[PDB]
Amino acid sequence: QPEPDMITIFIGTWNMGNAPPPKKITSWFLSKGQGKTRDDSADYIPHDIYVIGTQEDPLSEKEWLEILKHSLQEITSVTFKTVAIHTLWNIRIVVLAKPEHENRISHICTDNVKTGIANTLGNKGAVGVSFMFNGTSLGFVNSHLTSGSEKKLRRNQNYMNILRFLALGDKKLSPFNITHRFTHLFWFGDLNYRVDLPTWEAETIIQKIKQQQYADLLSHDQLLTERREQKVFLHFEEEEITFAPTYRFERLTRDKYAYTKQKATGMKYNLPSWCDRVLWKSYPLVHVVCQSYGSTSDIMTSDHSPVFATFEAGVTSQFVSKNGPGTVDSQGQIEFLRCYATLKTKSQTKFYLEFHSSCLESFVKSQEGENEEGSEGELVVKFGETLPKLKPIISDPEYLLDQHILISIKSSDSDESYGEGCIALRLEATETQLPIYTPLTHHGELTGHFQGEIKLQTSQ
C-alpha cells in the first residue's frame, strides 16, 4: 500500500452554549448548510483526520467521544481511532483518524494555556494537539478568546499568550513558537471577534443577513480589520466567509438573532457576529487548499451555530536511504550566499543564526554577523558568504526539495531569539544561486526580515 502524498482534514468549531447537542449532528461533519459546502457526491468519503473544537462544552470526554464516533460511523461506516482528547474547563479538542493511519501517527502532544490574571483567569484559553503524520508535522489549536465587542485588544493579547506558551511539537525547536513548529497549523475556535457597527444598527444588520449581503458586515468584522492592521494572526490565512454570522441566535430556531442587552449578557449587546472561525498557516510552498468553510443550519441547541472547514493538505513519507537517517549524505549540501537580516530592534548586541530542520542531524549555529546601519534607521546584520554549509541526512531530491529550514537570529549576549522564520527548499533549480526570503517574527510580531541567496545540491 503506497503512503499518501495528500490527506483531507476536517476542522470543526462549536460553542455549545453549555447545552447538550441534539440527537443528529451529521450535517456538521458533512460540511452541509451555509457558505462553501461539500459536494453531495463526497458524503460517503471519510476525511483522513477529524479535529473537533468545542467551547462551553457541558459533556464529559466520554459522552462527547461516544457522540462523535457514532456520528462518523453513521456517515462513513468507519470506526475512527482516538488520536488525542484534551479539555481545559469547558474548552475541548478531539482528534480522530481513520484506523489505517494509526501507525502513520506518532509524537502526539497535548497542551493548554489559561489566559488572563485573577478576574480574567478562570474560563478562557486554548487547548492544542500536535503529532507527526509520516514526515509531516500537524498542529491544531482550539481557543476560546475574551468575549465582548469592546475587548478586541484583549482577544489580540489572548492570541499572543496562547502562541507564546502553548507547548506543542518538537521541544528541540527551542527558539520557535507554535507558529513555526508545524508543516500545517490550524487555529480555530470561538475567537469572539465582533461586527463593530453601532448598536442602533442591529435591525439593519439583521436585514442585511436575511438578504445574504455580508459585504458591508465583513468590512466591520474585527478579526478581518485587526488582521489587516497586522495586530493579530500575522501570516495566517482564512477562507472567504460566505455564511451568515454564527452568533448570537435564539436557541431551538435559526430564524432569530438575540442581540439585545439582558442581565444574562452583563447588559452587553451581542450584534450578529462571526465569532466562530478557522484559520491556518502552512510552511511555504506546501499544498494546502480549503475545500469547505461554512456553518450548519439544522443544529440549534446553542446560541452559536457549528462551523466546519475542510482542507487538502500535502504530506510526505518517512524517508529512509542507505545513508540517512543516522549519518549525512555527502551528495547533499545547502549553501547561503549574500545573506543579511534586517531587524527592527533598537539594541546593539552581536547576532548569530541557528538553522533548524528535520533534514539536519541537529541544529547549526553560525558565526556572528557584521552589524551595519540601515539608511532608514534599521539594524542590518550582514552574514555575506560566512554562513556554514548545511549537511542534510538524505541527498535524494524527492526528499530534500520537500524540506524547510527554520531560522532564528539570536543575541550573542543573551542567546534570546530576536526573530524566527522559515525557508522552503522547493527551489526552481538545484546547483543554482536563487533568491530566498522570509519575514522574521518573535512572539508572532514582525521583528525583521532575512534575505539572501541559496544554492542547493542534491544527488541528481
Ligand X SMILES: CCN1CCC(Nc2ccccc2F)CC1
Binding site for ligand X (CB under 6 A): 81-83, 97, 102-103, 105-106, 224, 227-228
In the complex, what is the shortest distance from the CB of residue 283 to ligand X, in angstroms, rounded to a whole number? 14
Nearer to ligand X, 191 or 379 (CB): 191
Query: Least CB distance from residue 196 to ligand X, whole Å?
Result: 15
Least distance in angstroms from the C-beta of 152 to ligand X = 14
8 Å CB contact between 268 and 261: yes
CA distance 337 to 215: 46
What is the C-alpha to C-alpha distance for residues 406 and 426, in angstroms, rounded to an integer?
14
Q: Which is nearer to ligand X, 82 or 260 (CB)?
A: 82
Dihedral sign of CA atoms 102, 88, 9, 169 in order: negative
Beta bridge partners of 335: 455
Output the smallest distance, CB 227 to ligand X, in A: 4
- Residue-wise DSSP of 340-358: EEEE-------EEEEEE-T
Query: What is the helix, strand, coil percentage profile of the chain, to 5?
Result: 15, 35, 50
In whole angstroms, what is the distance from residue 77 CA to residue 26 CA?
13
**Cβ of residue 375: shortest distance to ligand X, in angstroms?**
25
Q: Are 118 and 138 in contact (CB under 8 A)?
A: no
Distance between CA atoms of 178 and 211, rounded to whole angstroms?
Answer: 40
- Measured from the CB atom, the residue of 240 and 415 that comes closer to ligand X is 240
Nearer to ligand X, 159 or 355 (CB): 159
Q: Which residue, 42 or 65, is less far from ligand X as judged by CB? A: 65
* DSSP calls for 32-48: -SEEE---GGGTTSPPS
Please identify, using beta-carbon distances, which residue of 38 and 227 lies nearer to ligand X: 227
- Residue with smaller CB distance to ligand X, 107 or 365: 107
On the 0-12 / 13-18 / 19+ scale of CB atoms within 10 A, 201 is: middle
Maximal C-alpha separation, the chain: 70
User: Is 34 within 8 Å of 294 (Cβ atoms)?
Assistant: yes
- Rounded Cα–Cα distance for residues 306 and 310 (Å): 14
Cell 443577513, located at residue: 209
* Torsion on CA atoms 239, 127, 300, 19, rounded to nearest 10: -170
Minimum CB–partner distance for residue 142 and ligand X (Å): 19
Least distance from C-beta 132 to ligand X, angstroms?
A: 9
Query: Closest CB to ligand X among 79 and 432?
Result: 79
Residue 162 CB, shortest distance to ligand X, in Å, is 19
End-to-end CA gap in the chain: 27
Whole-number minimum distance, CB 62 to ligand X, in Å? 16
Q: Looking at beta carbons only, is 81 or 164 nearer to ligand X?
A: 81
Q: Do residues 393 and 319 make contact, with C-beta atoms less than 8 angstroms apart?
A: no
